[PDB]
């Protein structure tokens, strides 16, 4: 699925990420934009490691799902990485929450280092009633 805006951020909302760990939902909405477009089906192949990105938010099997074939990858999450490419976001919250309860937290994920650290951000909440 392919989110759109304020559907996303109502979803994320209702999900309990409007400032989970004091991350903010403007915050969650930018992740999700520049890590996959708000596409939960989106997966990346890291060649170098032999790891793979799946969903919404991008997570990566070396750490957080299981996809049975990264080398000496763990399932912090403990889901199937599958989990991660569901229309409903749910376990793919539960996932990005365990990952920010990490002292990294939302510097977790580079993009977001890269696009909404420091950022005006307040364009991704605007008008969705959030």
């Known amino acids: 699925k392919v989110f759109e805006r304020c559907e996303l951020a109502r979803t994320l909302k ?6 989970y760990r004091g991350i903010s939902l403007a915050n969650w909405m930018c992740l999700a934009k520049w890590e996959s477009g708000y596409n939960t089906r989106a997966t990346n192949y890291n060649a170098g490691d032999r790891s793979t990105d799946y969903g919404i938010f991008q997570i990566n099997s070396r750490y957080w799902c299981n996809d049975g074939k990264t080398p000496g990858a763990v399932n912090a999450c403990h889901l199937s990485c599958s989990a991660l490419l569901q229309d409903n976001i749910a376990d793919a919250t539960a996932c990005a929450k365990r990952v920010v309860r ?8 580079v993009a977001w280092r890269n696009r909404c650290q420091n950022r005006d951000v307040r364009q991704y909440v605007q008008g969705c009633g959030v």
């Open 14 to 19: 209702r999900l309990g990420m409007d400032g």
């Open 102 to 109: 990490d002292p990294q937290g939302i510097r977790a994920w």
